Amino acid sequence: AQKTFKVTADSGIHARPATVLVQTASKYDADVNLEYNGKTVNLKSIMGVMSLGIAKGAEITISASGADENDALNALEETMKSEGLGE
Amino acid sequence: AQKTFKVTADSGIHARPATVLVQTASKYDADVNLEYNGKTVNLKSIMGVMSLGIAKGAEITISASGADENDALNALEETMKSEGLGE
Amino acid sequence: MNITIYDVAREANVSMATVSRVVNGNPNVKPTTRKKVLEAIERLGYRPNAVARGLASKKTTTVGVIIPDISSIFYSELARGIEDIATMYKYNIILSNSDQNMEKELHLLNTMLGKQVDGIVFMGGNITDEHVAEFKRSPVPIVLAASVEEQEETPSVAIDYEQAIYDAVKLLVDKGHTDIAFVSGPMAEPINRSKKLQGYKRALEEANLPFNEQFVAEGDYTYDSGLEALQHLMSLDKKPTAILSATDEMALGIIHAAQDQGLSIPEDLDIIGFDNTRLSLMVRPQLSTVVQPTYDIGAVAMRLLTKLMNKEPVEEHIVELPHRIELRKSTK
Amino acid sequence: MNITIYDVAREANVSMATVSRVVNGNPNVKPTTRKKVLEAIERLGYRPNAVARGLASKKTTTVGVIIPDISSIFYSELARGIEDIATMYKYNIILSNSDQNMEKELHLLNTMLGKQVDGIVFMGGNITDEHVAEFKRSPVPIVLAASVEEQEETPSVAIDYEQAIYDAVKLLVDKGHTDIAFVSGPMAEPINRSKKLQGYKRALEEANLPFNEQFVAEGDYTYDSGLEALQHLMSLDKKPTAILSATDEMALGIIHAAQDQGLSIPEDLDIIGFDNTRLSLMVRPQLSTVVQPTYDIGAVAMRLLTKLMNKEPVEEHIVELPHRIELRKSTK
DNA sequence: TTGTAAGCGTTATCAA
DNA sequence: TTGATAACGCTTACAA
């Protein structure tokens, strides 16, 4: 699976919102990742997602592979716009 | 022994300072009191001191009556001017 | 692996029993023995295990605090009081955020009661009967803080909000105002609907003034809601001459939203906030607010809890601290 | 005697072990049994005791948190970050203010270690060689949050304060400024004397601009110390053209103070704050600031502690989160 | 699956 | 004054 968004959120991918995104990806078996122009981290890791410093006006790529690698990518996409993060 | 002050504090006897005045009156065996507008409460009691509602302007009256009612009244004055709560 | 009282008893040819007595300064302990084990402990760097003690003594000298959002300028102020008076009385604290989520609130309550807290200080925007049920089921005292409980069953410490909004609203009439608007917090919460909104309508009908169901804006305690509130109250054919917000933060949104619209405070409009937080001192023009002893509320509540935990008799479990108003530059 | 795991067992006609397995969700209970016991638990009003759980298990699922003052707009926000990541990992927190008093800090440390915390997150402004020594001989993992440690040998998470200021001063230098001031925080704390300040002095040296002592104002984090810093700078024969505040709270003091002297921000003075707190937005004009992912600091710090409490490997004990300047309207 | 029993560190009850 | 020795409520091998 895979999907590239564009952080629209002012605060970017940080704080509670970033936390929620990391928890969602956490409940799925399939491995989930987040690639920010170059580096790639584990979306199920609070340290990884917050270390990129993904600010508004950036492009990321959320990928998922494994068992529920489908429902995973879907749920994330939802959270993404649900928490008012990326498009 | 007793002394009267005129609450110079901008917030009066409240917040931390208030708490400080009460903890000082408790460091002494003597029976420290505090009268205001015709009502006296224990100066060691957070509930009494903070129930009065001493605001900037008004004037209180710190009491005392024990084997150290002196070292206490003095100490009370120290704090009364340290945080700037009357004089 | 920390050292137990057994290691001490060893390092002093004494029995665990006397070490325990020495650690709690039990009277009947020959001075020779006391100082012998006393220095013994220090030689071993013995720190008593509070959990083990907590099992035996059925007392953990720790109260649990349930608060909606500690990052809040208001609640964190209350947290300081609770915390200061707590330390005064040698009490530790377990702080947890609820975010005004019933599920979380009742869950936190179970959790704290589970870790054997000796008491709880509860703060929430919506206390339902389902809460009171769980409260009444608590083995340890529970004191409310800055919250509203319609049931009036749980001991709480706060101020008359209804009276406060009234004093404010009237004050505006005494200065002339006829069309006074009100910007409240989520109506879902009793403190806004049943207490503040009432003290507002009361001051009006008691001042023969007609209630205008359009001068009531429902902000969400946010700075933006208060910002979007003034933009609304300045649209209707009939617009207010004075606005009273339920919290200072909304107040700034009102001040600014207006300043950005050209009108200048207080010249064109008169604004009064509620709570009297440092936010009301860091605004231009300085905001007039309905004063509220936030720290005192937290501190009186924790002091009351201590009185209930020590099982000592207490008068009127429902306390009310005095409130006043502090006008500044936001009102002519 | 009052509803313990033993009573539940008698009721469901099973052993204490099965009641303990059902209670912990151990997948080894014949459905007809796990049910029989859950029934009993309900009927008896049984609540598992965590203290007893703690004694037995050798851990208490709660961590310690030493914060200088939670009523701070900054530290409170940093606290919500810690608390949220702890809940995420089924952990409770014991909060306590240190007020930066070394005596209190070291004491709270000892208390919490006593209460048998599974870990601690520490926030201070002056970590001495002793603090370091103390931390090093702690039974449980300790993690600093947004704090400075010259000896940098204690895991911690924060940002590079010397680089952040540098970036901010450079930015202003590139805008053609030449006389840039700096309103700092108490020079006592290293973060101000050894980091923020040097970041400031460096940018100027790498720009070949001379260091002007009179351009370094020492505030105290107080909105008011902000107003005073401005007055003093705009009192010099050679005034600054831009001012960098080590804190937003001080920055608003700067804006409003100058706003009162008649100056017109940003036209007459470029101002830049530090922290990017909620205040930055609630100011007119909008305050340009150096962004510090405060919350993230509190979260990555607690997330680091979970790894360490779970005795798992970790790459680098010192972590630096990124920063960036967000320009609003307080800057031309 | 389910039961038995040995801890875990302190306080507390009785006798010495 | 001291010192054995039960509680305290629950986790966990080790067994059955």
Coordinates of all heavy atoms in Angstrom, one line a residue, chain B residues 46 50, chain C residues 75 77-86 121 123 143-146 157-158 293-304 321:
Chain B
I46 N -5.6 27.4 56.2 CA -5.7 27.8 54.8 C -7.2 28.1 54.5 O -7.5 29.1 53.9 CB -5.2 26.7 53.8 CG1 -3.7 26.6 53.8 CG2 -5.8 27.0 52.4 CD1 -3.0 27.7 53.1
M50 N -8.1 32.2 53.5 CA -8.6 32.3 52.2 C -10.1 32.5 52.0 O -10.6 32.7 50.9 CB -8.1 31.2 51.3 CG -6.7 31.3 50.9 SD -6.2 30.0 49.7 CE -4.7 29.4 50.5
Chain C
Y75 N -6.8 25.7 34.6 CA -6.6 24.5 35.3 C -5.2 24.4 35.9 O -5.1 24.0 37.1 CB -6.9 23.3 34.5 CG -8.4 23.2 34.1 CD1 -8.8 23.5 32.8 CD2 -9.4 23.0 35.1 CE1 -10.2 23.6 32.5 CE2 -10.7 23.1 34.8 CZ -11.1 23.3 33.5 OH -12.5 23.4 33.2
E77 N -3.4 26.6 37.0 CA -3.3 27.5 38.1 C -3.9 26.8 39.3 O -3.4 26.8 40.4 CB -4.1 28.8 37.8 CG -4.3 29.7 39.0 CD -3.0 30.3 39.4 OE1 -1.9 29.9 38.9 OE2 -3.1 31.2 40.3
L78 N -5.0 26.1 39.1 CA -5.7 25.3 40.1 C -4.8 24.2 40.5 O -4.7 23.9 41.7 CB -7.0 24.8 39.6 CG -8.3 25.5 39.8 CD1 -9.3 25.3 38.7 CD2 -8.9 25.1 41.1
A79 N -4.1 23.6 39.6 CA -3.2 22.5 39.9 C -2.1 22.9 40.8 O -1.6 22.1 41.6 CB -2.6 21.9 38.6
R80 N -1.7 24.2 40.8 CA -0.7 24.7 41.6 C -1.2 24.7 43.1 O -0.5 24.3 44.0 CB -0.2 26.0 41.1 CG 1.0 26.6 41.9 CD 2.1 25.6 42.2 NE 3.4 26.2 42.0 CZ 4.5 25.8 42.7 NH1 4.4 24.8 43.5 NH2 5.7 26.4 42.4
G81 N -2.4 25.2 43.3 CA -2.9 25.3 44.6 C -3.0 23.9 45.2 O -2.4 23.6 46.2
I82 N -3.7 23.0 44.5 CA -3.9 21.7 45.0 C -2.6 21.1 45.4 O -2.4 20.5 46.5 CB -4.5 20.8 43.8 CG1 -5.8 21.4 43.4 CG2 -4.7 19.4 44.3 CD1 -6.6 20.5 42.3
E83 N -1.6 21.2 44.5 CA -0.2 20.7 44.7 C 0.5 21.3 45.9 O 1.2 20.7 46.7 CB 0.5 20.9 43.4 CG 2.0 20.7 43.5 CD 2.5 19.3 43.5 OE1 2.0 18.5 42.6 OE2 3.3 18.9 44.3
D84 N 0.4 22.7 46.1 CA 1.0 23.3 47.2 C 0.5 22.9 48.6 O 1.3 22.5 49.4 CB 1.0 24.8 47.1 CG 1.9 25.4 46.1 OD1 2.7 24.6 45.4 OD2 2.0 26.6 45.9
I85 N -0.8 22.9 48.7 CA -1.4 22.5 50.0 C -1.2 21.0 50.2 O -1.2 20.5 51.4 CB -2.9 22.9 50.0 CG1 -3.0 24.3 50.5 CG2 -3.7 22.0 51.0 CD1 -2.0 25.3 50.0
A86 N -1.1 20.3 49.1 CA -0.8 18.8 49.2 C 0.5 18.6 49.9 O 0.6 17.9 50.9 CB -0.9 18.2 47.8
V121 N -9.5 14.8 44.1 CA -10.0 16.2 43.9 C -10.5 16.1 42.5 O -9.7 15.8 41.6 CB -8.9 17.3 44.0 CG1 -9.4 18.6 43.4 CG2 -8.4 17.5 45.4
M123 N -12.4 17.6 39.0 CA -12.8 18.8 38.2 C -13.3 18.5 36.9 O -12.7 17.8 36.1 CB -11.5 19.7 38.0 CG -10.9 20.2 39.3 SD -9.3 21.0 39.1 CE -8.3 19.6 39.3
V143 N -13.5 15.5 46.8 CA -13.8 16.9 46.8 C -13.8 17.5 45.4 O -12.9 17.2 44.6 CB -12.8 17.7 47.7 CG1 -13.2 19.2 47.6 CG2 -12.9 17.3 49.2
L144 N -14.8 18.3 45.1 CA -14.9 18.9 43.8 C -14.2 20.2 43.8 O -14.1 20.8 44.9 CB -16.3 19.1 43.3 CG -17.1 17.8 43.1 CD1 -18.5 18.2 42.5 CD2 -16.4 16.8 42.2
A145 N -13.7 20.7 42.6 CA -13.1 22.0 42.6 C -13.5 22.7 41.3 O -13.5 22.2 40.2 CB -11.6 21.8 42.5
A146 N -13.9 24.0 41.5 CA -14.3 24.9 40.4 C -15.3 24.2 39.5 O -15.4 24.6 38.4 CB -13.1 25.3 39.7
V157 N -15.7 23.0 46.4 CA -15.2 24.4 46.7 C -15.3 25.2 45.5 O -14.7 24.7 44.5 CB -13.8 24.3 47.2 CG1 -13.2 25.6 47.3 CG2 -13.7 23.6 48.6
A158 N -15.9 26.3 45.5 CA -15.9 27.2 44.3 C -16.6 28.5 44.6 O -16.4 29.0 45.7 CB -16.7 26.5 43.2
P293 N -10.6 33.5 42.5 CA -9.4 33.0 43.2 C -9.0 31.6 42.8 O -8.9 30.7 43.6 CB -9.8 33.1 44.7 CG -11.3 32.7 44.6 CD -11.8 33.5 43.4
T294 N -8.7 31.5 41.5 CA -8.4 30.2 41.0 C -7.5 29.3 41.9 O -7.8 28.2 42.3 CB -7.7 30.3 39.6 OG1 -8.6 31.1 38.7 CG2 -7.6 28.9 38.9
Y295 N -6.3 29.8 42.2 CA -5.4 29.1 43.1 C -6.1 28.8 44.5 O -6.0 27.7 45.0 CB -4.1 29.9 43.4 CG -3.1 29.3 44.3 CD1 -1.9 28.7 43.9 CD2 -3.3 29.3 45.7 CE1 -0.9 28.3 44.8 CE2 -2.4 28.9 46.6 CZ -1.2 28.4 46.1 OH -0.2 28.0 47.0
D296 N -6.7 29.8 45.0 CA -7.4 29.6 46.3 C -8.4 28.5 46.3 O -8.5 27.7 47.2 CB -8.1 30.9 46.7 CG -7.2 32.0 47.2 OD1 -6.2 32.2 46.5 OD2 -7.5 32.7 48.2
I297 N -9.1 28.4 45.1 CA -10.1 27.4 45.0 C -9.4 26.0 45.1 O -9.8 25.2 45.8 CB -10.8 27.5 43.6 CG1 -11.6 28.8 43.6 CG2 -11.7 26.3 43.4 CD1 -12.4 29.0 42.3
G298 N -8.3 25.8 44.3 CA -7.6 24.6 44.3 C -7.0 24.3 45.7 O -7.1 23.2 46.2
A299 N -6.5 25.3 46.4 CA -5.9 25.2 47.7 C -6.9 25.0 48.8 O -6.7 24.2 49.7 CB -5.0 26.4 48.0
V300 N -8.1 25.6 48.7 CA -9.0 25.4 49.8 C -9.6 24.0 49.6 O -9.7 23.3 50.6 CB -10.2 26.4 49.7 CG1 -11.3 26.0 50.6 CG2 -9.7 27.8 50.2
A301 N -9.9 23.6 48.4 CA -10.4 22.2 48.1 C -9.4 21.1 48.7 O -9.9 20.2 49.4 CB -10.6 22.0 46.7
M302 N -8.1 21.2 48.4 CA -7.2 20.2 48.9 C -7.1 20.3 50.4 O -6.8 19.3 51.1 CB -5.8 20.4 48.3 CG -4.7 19.6 48.9 SD -5.0 17.8 48.6 CE -4.0 17.6 47.2
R303 N -7.2 21.5 51.0 CA -7.2 21.6 52.4 C -8.4 20.9 53.0 O -8.3 20.2 54.0 CB -7.2 23.1 52.8 CG -7.4 23.3 54.3 CD -6.3 22.6 55.1 NE -6.7 22.7 56.5 CZ -6.5 21.7 57.4 NH1 -5.9 20.6 57.0 NH2 -6.9 21.9 58.6
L304 N -9.5 21.1 52.3 CA -10.8 20.5 52.8 C -10.6 18.9 52.7 O -11.0 18.2 53.7 CB -12.0 20.9 52.0 CG -13.3 20.2 52.2 CD1 -13.6 20.0 53.7 CD2 -14.4 21.1 51.6
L321 N -16.2 30.5 48.0 CA -15.2 31.5 48.2 C -15.7 32.8 47.6 O -16.4 32.7 46.5 CB -13.9 31.2 47.6 CG -13.1 30.0 48.2 CD1 -11.9 29.6 47.4 CD2 -12.8 30.2 49.7

